[PDB]
Scaffold this active site. Structure first.
Site, short mmCIF file in Angstrom:
data_model
loop_
_atom_site.label_atom_id
_atom_site.label_comp_id
_atom_site.label_asym_id
_atom_site.label_seq_id
_atom_site.Cartn_x
_atom_site.Cartn_y
_atom_site.Cartn_z
N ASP A 64 -0.99 -4.38 9.92
CA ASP A 64 -2.18 -3.08 9.73
C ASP A 64 -3.29 -3.99 9.07
O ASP A 64 -3.31 -4.99 8.22
CB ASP A 64 -1.57 -2.72 8.06
CG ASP A 64 -2.61 -1.74 7.34
OD1 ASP A 64 -3.94 -1.81 7.75
OD2 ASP A 64 -2.29 -0.82 6.86
N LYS B 250 -13.92 0.23 6.25
CA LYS B 250 -14.58 -0.51 5.45
C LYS B 250 -15.57 -1.76 5.82
O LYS B 250 -16.73 -1.75 5.28
CB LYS B 250 -13.47 -1.42 4.47
CG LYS B 250 -12.62 -0.53 3.73
CD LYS B 250 -11.10 -0.19 4.20
CE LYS B 250 -10.33 0.50 3.16
NZ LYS B 250 -8.91 0.28 3.60
N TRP C 266 0.98 -1.24 -0.04
CA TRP C 266 0.07 -0.04 -0.02
C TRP C 266 0.95 1.25 0.14
O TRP C 266 1.86 1.26 0.97
CB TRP C 266 -0.81 0.18 1.07
CG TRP C 266 -2.05 0.81 1.42
CD1 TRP C 266 -3.08 0.80 0.49
CD2 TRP C 266 -2.23 1.73 2.49
NE1 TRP C 266 -3.74 1.96 1.00
CE2 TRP C 266 -3.60 2.31 1.93
CE3 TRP C 266 -1.63 2.07 3.51
CZ2 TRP C 266 -4.13 3.28 3.08
CZ3 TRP C 266 -2.11 3.22 4.46
CH2 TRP C 266 -3.36 3.52 3.96
C1 LIG Z 1 -8.35 1.30 4.23
C2 LIG Z 1 -6.67 0.95 4.86
C3 LIG Z 1 -6.37 1.63 5.69
C4 LIG Z 1 -6.92 2.49 6.82
O1 LIG Z 1 -7.82 3.37 6.11
P1 LIG Z 1 -8.48 4.46 6.92
O2 LIG Z 1 -9.57 5.03 6.05
O3 LIG Z 1 -7.50 5.32 7.41
O4 LIG Z 1 -9.07 3.98 8.24
C5 LIG Z 1 -4.91 1.07 6.14
N1 LIG Z 1 -4.11 0.20 5.38
C6 LIG Z 1 -4.75 -0.16 4.35
C7 LIG Z 1 -3.76 -1.39 3.44
C8 LIG Z 1 -6.11 -0.08 3.88
O5 LIG Z 1 -6.40 -0.53 2.60
#
Ligand SMILES: *Cc1c(COP(=O)(O)O)cnc(C)c1O
Ligand SMILES: *Cc1c(COP(=O)(O)O)cnc(C)c1O
EC number: 2.6.1.1
Lengths: 396, 396
Positions: free
Chosen positions: B211, B246, B130
């Site tokens: 994460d 999510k 990411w």
């Molecule tokens: C969605 C996501 C997050 C955190 O998203 P927030 O909208 O800040 O809660 C962190 N890491 C990954 C890999 C994600 O897909």
């Protein structure tokens, strides 16, 4: 890896909450953290706010991410509130606003932005000042220096000393000013003193940073912003970190804004792109609920009318408690005149107690206040004023 | 002061939103940012969430500041969701949780904490990973290194390469793992591979950082956490940055948590005090609304039952669209087998498109995806699947 970590020092203000909670004595009085309380000693949700939340519940159709800078409407309403409905700054598109998690969040974003994108190395704050100011800027790697402000003997603004101390400030240095309701002194510059400071700032080349967390609590919404507007009329660049925690009673929803102003739209856009970059690596995008409520209220004539009256009632209850506080102190036999507190704007009373007197009020009387001697007048009610004053008189 | 500021580079993912908006062509398809969409192509508010908001509107009596670490109930429910209802970590009070503004906020807090309070100097992330992972840790002053993960030729987890690359990682280094639904590959370690990684991590002395942003989207709530729990059974210390954006569809309310685990309660408390210190100088305290909704849902048997079914329906619609996607590609005459995408967990499809093919899909077909070739399957509907596939087939 965590074996040798040291216990962090408690926050001088937010740490009071934990102490007040542990205390099990019946008549304990909380006059620490600067939150508003009504005659009942409760911190209620404003009616205008509850009506806005009802509206959102009925009309929100998604929780999809907001943009990095937040709700556009929120930003527009904020700029109008700060600079005036028909300001040239707005018409010339010289200002960009990012919705942030509270005014503290706004300060941190400003700090990260400055540290990474400018030559700024020093920030000047008033003496005394809000404790978290030093902590926030220091965290971003910026050194903090203090400039004279309060005259502890006469309980007034020592303007001569302010000017003298700021002369050590160099061009390119940031000077932080409290928009109104200086925390914790409650003493603000007169409109003429603001005008003088504005002129001096332009000539010395300082970058002004306003912490505007109490708009509406001194005299009024428009009146409380004249100092900032005096600066905005002469400066090419400036930064404003404002908060809606107190004037909307939205403390825990974390609603604030960081406004950036530049010479022209081309420059502010370029600069604002780096501010968004700083946000991106912090919390990504801001929380919607609180800011949605604020935008809903400010953009609806009916809701705004209700909110403005509520703000007025808050300001008026504090002012009433202030005169009553002074009156009850003399009635209870205080051996000192505290009438100077009537000149103070905002929620606090400052300058009449020593660190030991504060500690004693807590240990022996269960009265909680900040070690600096700052008392939250907005936390005084007709019901706790008597015992409060008896305790104070007992430690003088 | 802002004359020489450089324009910041656009975010490879969040920046798509602005491009998609500017685009005025009718049939444009948004498959970029990882947000869920129903059969109608809308990102709705969950029913369980709307019911919780109704509850809050009716029973909230104040907006007073939450503590630095947020709502206690929120923290308890989060720990149970992560480690299991009767986990020893919870019983032995070895874990402390701070409510944060989203999972990104959680990552930043973790980063600031590590940089200022430990000897950590390097963080290892997967290749590919990411994008914001590197940005966040780099901002805190930590260097980021990559470890082999994805086998681009066979579209699988190259375990041998993973082990080989991580051997260059030294004791005291942080290794970041995606709890489940690896972003963007969608390929996760099997339970046995997790167990092997857990053992290796203990012996090498790495500090694991998970994460966890997609709990519930791979197989289920409990199942998706077995890898983390395998690690938590053998490690003395670890950090978990989770998100409810999510699985609750609370994207814009910024709801997440940073969980710290230590050998004993005495140590975690000391360490957690420094984590609170890092929060204090950032945004002070977290936004209440979103986290309040989550705590309300998880702590009420009735609301939790509704939410769990909604999560299930979300997961199932994505899986259905995946098989339909592959089927329509072969039906439209694709000259390549994409059935490997069926093995991928989560919302994305990854590995079959080059940077140029993505650019062409956008310029010529109005199909928006991430430059890395990541497509949001959760953004596919029975109505846009046909034109989507015709466009893809056209660029292969
Ligand atoms: C969605 C996501 C997050 C955190 O998203 P927030 O909208 O800040 O809660 C962190 N890491 C990954 C890999 C994600 O897909
Ligand atoms: C209340 C206050 C702020 C900001 O508070 P938030 O709760 O973070 O919005 C900033 N500066 C001062 C001096 C304040 O009194």
């Amino acid at each position: 890896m965590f074996e040798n970590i040291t216990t962090a020092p408690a926050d001088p203000i937010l740490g009071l909450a934990d102490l007040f909670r542990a205390d099990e004595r019946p008549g304990k009085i909380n006059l620490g953290i600067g939150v508003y309380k009504d005659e009942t000693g409760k911190t209620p949700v404003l009616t205008s706010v509850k009506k806005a939340e009802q509206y959102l519940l009925e009309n929100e159709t998604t929780k999809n991410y907001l943009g990095i800078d937040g709700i556009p409407e929120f930003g527009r309403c904020t700029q109008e509130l700060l600079f005036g409905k028909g300001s040239a700054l707005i018409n010339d598109k010289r200002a960009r606003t990012a919705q942030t998690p509270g005014g503290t969040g706004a300060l941190r974003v400003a700090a990260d932005f400055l540290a990474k994108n400018t030559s700024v190395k020093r920030v000047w704050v008033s003496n005394p000042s809000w404790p978290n100011h030093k902590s926030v800027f220091n965290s971003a790697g910026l050194e903090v220096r203090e400039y004279a402000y309060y005259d502890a003997e006469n309980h007034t603004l020592d303007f001569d000393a302010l000017i003298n101390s700021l002369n050590e400030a160099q061009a390119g240095d940031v000077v932080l000013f409290h928009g109104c309701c200086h925390n914790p002194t409650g003493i603000d510059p007169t409109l003429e003193q603001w005008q003088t400071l504005a002129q001096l700032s332009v000539e010395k080349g300082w970058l002004p940073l306003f912490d505007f967390a109490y708009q509406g609590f001194a005299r009024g919404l428009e009146e409380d912003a004249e100092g900032l507007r005096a600066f905005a009329a002469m400066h090419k660049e400036l930064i404003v970190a404002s908060s809606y925690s107190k004037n909307f009673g939205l403390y825990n929803e974390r609603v604030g804004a960081c406004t950036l102003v530049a010479a022209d739209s081309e420059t502010v856009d370029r600069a604002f792109s780096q501010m968004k970059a700083a946000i991106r690596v912090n919390y990504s995008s801001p929380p919607a609920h609180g800011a949605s409520v604020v935008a809903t209220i400010l953009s609806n004539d009916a809701l705004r009318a209700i909110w403005e009256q509520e703000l007025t009632d808050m300001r008026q209850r504090i002012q009433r408690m202030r005169q009553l506080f002074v009156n009850t102190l003399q009635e209870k036999g205080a051996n000192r005149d505290f009438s100077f507190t009537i000149k103070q704007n905002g929620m606090f009373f400052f300058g009449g107690l020593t660190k030991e007197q504060v500690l004693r009020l807590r240990e022996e009387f269960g009265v909680y206040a900040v070690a600096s001697g700052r008392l939250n007048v907005a936390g005084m009610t007709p019901d706790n004023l008597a015992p409060l004053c008896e305790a104070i008189v007992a430690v003088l």
